[PDB]
Amino acid sequence: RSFVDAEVDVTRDIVSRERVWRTRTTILQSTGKNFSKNIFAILQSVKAREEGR
Amino acid sequence: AGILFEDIFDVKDIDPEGKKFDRVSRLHCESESFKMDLILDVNIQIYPVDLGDKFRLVIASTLYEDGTLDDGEYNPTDDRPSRADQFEYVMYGKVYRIEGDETSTEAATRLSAYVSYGGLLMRLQGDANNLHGFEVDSRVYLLMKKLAF
Amino acid sequence: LPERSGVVCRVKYCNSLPDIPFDPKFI
Amino acid sequence: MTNQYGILFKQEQAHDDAIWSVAWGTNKKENSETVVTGSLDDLVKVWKWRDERLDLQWSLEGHQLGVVSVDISHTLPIAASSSLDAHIRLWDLENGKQIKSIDAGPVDAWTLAFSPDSQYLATGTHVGKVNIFGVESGKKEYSLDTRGKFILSIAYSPDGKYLASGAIDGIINIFDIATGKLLHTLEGHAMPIRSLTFSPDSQLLVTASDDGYIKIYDVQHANLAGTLSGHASWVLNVAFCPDDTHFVSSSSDKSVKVWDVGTRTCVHTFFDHQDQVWGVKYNGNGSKIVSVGDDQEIHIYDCPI
Amino acid sequence: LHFRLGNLGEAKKYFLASLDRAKAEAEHDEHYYNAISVTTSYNLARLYEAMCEFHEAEKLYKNILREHPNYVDCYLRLGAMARDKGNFYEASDWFKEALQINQDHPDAWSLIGNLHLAKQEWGPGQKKFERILKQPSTQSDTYSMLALGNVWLQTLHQPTRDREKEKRHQDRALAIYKQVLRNDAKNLYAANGIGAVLAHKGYFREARDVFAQVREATADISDVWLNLAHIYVEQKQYISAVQMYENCLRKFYKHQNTEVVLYLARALFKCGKLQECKQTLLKARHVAPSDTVLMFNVALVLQRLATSVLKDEKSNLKEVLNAVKELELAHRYFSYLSKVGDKMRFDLALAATEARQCSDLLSQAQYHVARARKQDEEERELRAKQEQEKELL
């Protein structure tokens, strides 16, 4: 709508001042522990069993 | 197995009545999953812990993952896999008392298992289903590690 | 042999993602 | 009389397990107050309210799968109770003995409510029908069919003209008692309606749902009068005050909230419960509120008049 | 900050004071202080939502939309409130308005996706998350990848007769979770997803090691506690599992989640705690009385209790009479369930078998009633002998 579309610059101004720390990405993350090294080793052990080795 | 108990604890108070010794301090922790109470004396000099620290505590009957039941003598030279490899602080001591809300009419709902690590005391107070491997006058290991979160 | 009838319950290992966080915005 | 809401009495460990329903009745002969409680421990306990304390009068044994709902006759000293075992039992409050046992069937008995004249006893069913049993006959006399799903809540209008039922799919049905005709079907809530009650003047119908909102409907025009919000979890029970201006609600959030119908604002909130509060009821003059929950405790609150 | 601490009472004071001050400051720079007034009004609306005063929250969001219709976050909260009211249709309409304003907004697409997944509309939901991963700025978006992984994971809860199809779905879910964990080594849900697939594959030791690491990293994921409890049941550590289900219920659900209560009942049953199991299943049935599975499990526990009381000759007359009544309840429920039970969740032949077994036991139970009467009368005689001997002394 022509009256809606004219005011987008105002909202862009507001959003430039806002700061959000918890987002869709950070909500999923641990505070400090890395799982990749440990879990990939576990998966390697399972993979070895699935391949019968 | 031989894991008599195991849980995640978070330190709620260090030596609440004030520090009685320099290298030893009380940890008044409460667990998160089994909801256990815990009083533990740690050598705060070699293994410093702060308030609000979370640690994995694993009171074990033996250090060999195959559960082959040690004989209580000290010998550092050993190639056998040991739980101590993945733990930071390890103690050893006897259970010297088990105490619950026993009544003449029914058994205790809650048990407090006391452990003495060669002089440093502990008391693990919970409910009477967790503290079952505990039996007075038996060796146990404390195997605890601070959580990097 | 007739398997002893257990409690009818399908064990589901879940991985439900958290709701999207619409936390208050700092200025 | 306190000009402020507050807890007046606490009965700890009143039952061996969760308490699911409570009713407050006034024995007009003695002008003495009686509280009836139903619990998962299979017992229906009858308490006498005297000198600001609850005295246990009778422990009624007979149910086998916990008591889901209890009610007390407004005119006779008779209480009715339902259980997950689907049996409905009538109890004599003066003698503390079972009058009659009605076997509804494995799926035909749920929440229970006496008609204002106490001639009939209505109960919700799994097949979406409201079965009405004669108190004197002890037999199923007739049945009202909503054609919906499981009926979780039912209430008679105090004037005896309308019977409301709330289903597990959130639909509210209002039946005309004189003709047995379905008058109104309301979209209600999108989640289960666990309890509903008419105002003493029968002009308003209040409904409580798992969505955490409470809705007020105009009974004469069936229009949505207003929506109340404030509970952080399911609203488990609602009961109107005999003064027609306030009603009390209980929730799984462990709180009991008193609402003003005119202002539609929360007047007071009680936080004394340790677990879900399944039942709340006003006394015969609206001056006191009783509550029961999963914590096995019975609380009585004093209210300004 | 007070809101983040849950100090909603203090937060109300600070947001209101901020709005009142911005109202005073607008005399100096009306445009900027109005922008502050928008952000603070949204925060206040979120506070009212946290206080559950949803009528005021809805009123504030609609006001923001009167003044700033491009402020997308107001639409998403209105949709979220509609979703929480269980009105998913209106919720989908509010999220569509948000997309009419910013067509590539990843949270609006994700909320719509979650609506479809909540409805188990796997096809539409999957398309909604793939729409996020198709844009270059979000081509590696971990939330969307995890959502797709979960879509594949959810197929594993269905009893699948095609073992190759099951394996293919397991490997798809695991491949996605591995990729997320490769992109983000700190991702809690990628690790838990891997643990879930490993548990479904039956590698309970390895799955335990994965979930144990996830619980070490965070205490606030409800599914991590449930997954650990499930493994404790499979490792026959029932005493620990029961405790985890009870603490999970107390910590994460403000209402009784019937699936978790059923898992608790299952653990108590395998633990042999039939009395606690009965009471737990009744608690679940009080919340969801139309669920035939809860009714079946109650009937089964009742039959087991009666079977035990009738099997042990130590049981007295009051106990045996109760057991007989419970066994008739069990027979009544199995007879009903054999006719109306949910064919998609359990086999009606099972209920018919239990119905017959109840009738068979009921025949022997009547004999046991006579046995119990005899035994009780013998005790009455002994008690009378004891009383008269007390008079003799």
Contacts of D232 (CB under 8 A, 6+ apart): D212, D251, D253, D255, E52, E254
Task: For residues E302 and E275, give the distance between their C-alpha atoms in angstroms, rounded to a whole number.
Answer: 9
Task: List C-alpha distances in Å: A18 to C27, D48, E77, E352.
Answer: 5, 60, 17, 64
Q: Tell me which chains share at least 3 CB pairs under 8 Å with chain D.
A: E
- Angle value at C-alpha D210, between E255 and E298, nearest 5 degrees: 60
Quote the minimal CA–CA distance from B73 to chain E in Å.
31
Task: For residues E297 and E257, give the distance between their C-alpha atoms in angstroms, rounded to a whole number.
Answer: 17
Q: What is the CATH number of the domain that holds D111?
A: 2.130.10.10
Tokens of D244: 């027609």
| Chains A and B, touching by 3 or more CB pairs within 8 angstroms | yes
HSE-CB at E241 with a 13 A cutoff on CA atoms is 26
Tokens of D26: 């006034």
Task: For residues D18 and D275, give the distance between their C-alpha atoms in angstroms, rounded to a whole number.
Answer: 9
Task: Yes or no: say if D182 and D140 are a contact pair by the CB < 8 Å rule.
Answer: no
Q: Which residues pair with D89 in a beta bridge?
A: D81, D101
Report the run of H or E that residue E268 belongs to, with start and end. helix E258-270
Q: Which residues pair with D208 in a beta bridge?
A: D195, D214
Which of A27, A29, A30, A39 would best serve as a mutation to test chain C binding (most C beta carbons within 10 A)? A27
HSE-CB at D287 with a 13 A cutoff on CA atoms is 9
Q: DSSP for E298-339, please give it.
A: HHHHHHHHHHHHHH-TT--HHHHHHHHHHHHHHHHHHHHHHH
> Sheet containing D44-50: which strands, arranged edge to edge?
D19-27, D32-39, D44-50, D53-60
- What count of other Cβ atoms lies within 10 Å of the Cβ of residue E378? 10
Task: For residues E107 and E97, give the distance between their C-alpha atoms in angstroms, rounded to a whole number.
Answer: 13
Query: Whole domain around residue B22: which residue ranges?
Result: 5-148
Give contacts of C20 with chain E, Cβ < 8 Å: 76, 107, 110-111, 114
Rg (CA), chain C: 21
> Resolution of this PDB entry, in A?
4.0
Query: Whole domain around residue D97: which residue ranges?
Result: 5-304
User: Do β-strands B54-57 and D32-39 pair in parallel, antiparallel, or remain unpaired?
Assistant: unpaired
Contact E225 B33 (CB under 8 A): yes
Q: Tell me how many domains chain B contains.
A: 1
Kindly tell me the sign of the dihedral angle through the C-alpha atoms of E342, E344, E346, E350: positive
Residue whose structure tokens are 């589901």: C12
Contact E86 D212 (CB under 8 A): no
Kindly tell me the sign of the dihedral angle through the C-alpha atoms of E22, E27, E28, E31: positive
Give contacts of A33 with chain B, Cβ < 8 Å: 148-149
With the CA atoms of D227, D232, D237 and D239 taken in that order, what torsion angle do they form, in degrees rounded to the nearest 10?
-50
Task: For residues D184 and D169, give the distance between their C-alpha atoms in angstroms, rounded to a whole number.
Answer: 16
If contacts are CB pairs under 8 Å, which of residues 301-340 in chain E contact chain C? none
Judge whether C27 is closer than 8 Å to chain A, CB to CB.
yes
| Chains D and E, touching by 3 or more CB pairs within 8 angstroms | yes
Kindly tell me the sign of the dihedral angle through the C-alpha atoms of D1, D2, D3, D7: negative
DSSP secondary structure letter of residue E161: S
Q: Which of C10, C17, C25 sits opposite E157 (nearest CB)?
A: C10
Chain centroid to CA B82: 17
Quote the minimal CA–CA distance from D28 to chain E in Å.
34
Residue whose structure tokens are 């039992």: D89
Task: Yes or no: say if E28 and E21 are a contact pair by the CB < 8 Å rule.
Answer: no
Chain centroid to CA D150: 17
- Helix-then-strand count for chain A, H and E: 3, 0
Give contacts of C21 with chain A, Cβ < 8 Å: 22-24, 27
Residues of E with CB under 8 A from a CB of B: 215-219, 225, 239-240, 242-244, 247
Cα-Cα end-to-end distance for chain C: 69
Judge whether A11 is closer than 8 Å to chain C, CB to CB.
no
HSE-CB at E205 with a 13 A cutoff on CA atoms is 4
Chain centroid to CA D115: 13
Q: What is the 3-state secondary structure of chain D? A: CCCCCEEEEEECCCCCCCEEEEEEEEECCCCEEEEEEEECCCCEEEEEEECCEEEEEEEECCCCCCEEEEEECCCCCEEEEEECCCEEEEEECCCCEEEEEEECCCCCCCCEEECCCCCEEEEECCCCEEEEEECCCCCEEEEEECCCCCEEEEEECCCCCEEEEEECCCCEEEEECCCCCEEEEECCCCCCEEEEEECCCCCEEEEEECCCEEEEEECCCCCEEEEEECCCCCEEEEEECCCCCEEEEEECCCCEEEEECCCCCEEEEECCCCCCEEEEEECCCCCEEEEEECCCCEEEEECCC
Task: For residues E351 and E361, give the distance between their C-alpha atoms in angstroms, rounded to a whole number.
Answer: 15
Please name the residue of chain B whose CA is at the shortest distance from the CA of residue E219: B32
Contact E4 C23 (CB under 8 A): yes
Task: Yes or no: say if D101 and D88 are a contact pair by the CB < 8 Å rule.
Answer: yes
Determine the 3-state secondary structure of B114 from DSSP. Answer: strand
Task: Yes or no: say if D17 and D39 are a contact pair by the CB < 8 Å rule.
Answer: yes
Q: Tell me which chains share at least 3 CB pairs under 8 Å with chain B.
A: A, E
Task: List C-alpha distances in Å: E314 to B34, E317, E327, E368, E385.
Answer: 35, 10, 18, 11, 21
User: Do β-strands D288-293 and D277-282 pair in parallel, antiparallel, or remain unpaired?
Assistant: antiparallel
With the CA atoms of D174, D179, D180 and D185 taken in that order, what torsion angle do they form, in degrees rounded to the nearest 10?
-30
Task: For residues B48 and B10, give the distance between their C-alpha atoms in angstroms, rounded to a whole number.
Answer: 14
Instruction: Identify the experimental approach.
Output: cryo-EM
Q: Classify the phi-psi angles of B84: left when phi > 0, otherwise alpha if psi is within -120 to 50, otherwise beta.
A: alpha
Residue whose C-alpha is closest to residue E242's, from E271, E204, E212, E207: E271
Report the run of H or E that residue B94 belongs to, with start and end. strand B92-100
Contacts of B128 (CB under 8 A, 6+ apart): B100, B107, B108, B109, B110, B111
Q: What is the CATH number of the domain that holds B116?
A: 2.40.50.140
Tokens of E363: 């025949």
Tokens of B52: 């609000």
Task: For residues A5 and D122, give the distance between their C-alpha atoms in angstroms, rounded to a whole number.
Answer: 58
- Angle value at C-alpha E59, between E57 and E62, nearest 5 degrees: 110
Contacts of D160 (CB under 8 A, 6+ apart): D115, D116, D117, D177
Task: Yes or no: say if D141 and D120 are a contact pair by the CB < 8 Å rule.
Answer: yes
Task: For residues E260 and E197, give the distance between their C-alpha atoms in angstroms, rounded to a whole number.
Answer: 20
Residue whose C-alpha is closest to residue E89's, from E119, E57, E66: E119
Q: Tell me how many domains chain D contains.
A: 1
- What count of other Cβ atoms lies within 10 Å of the Cβ of residue D3? 6
Contact D211 E332 (CB under 8 A): no
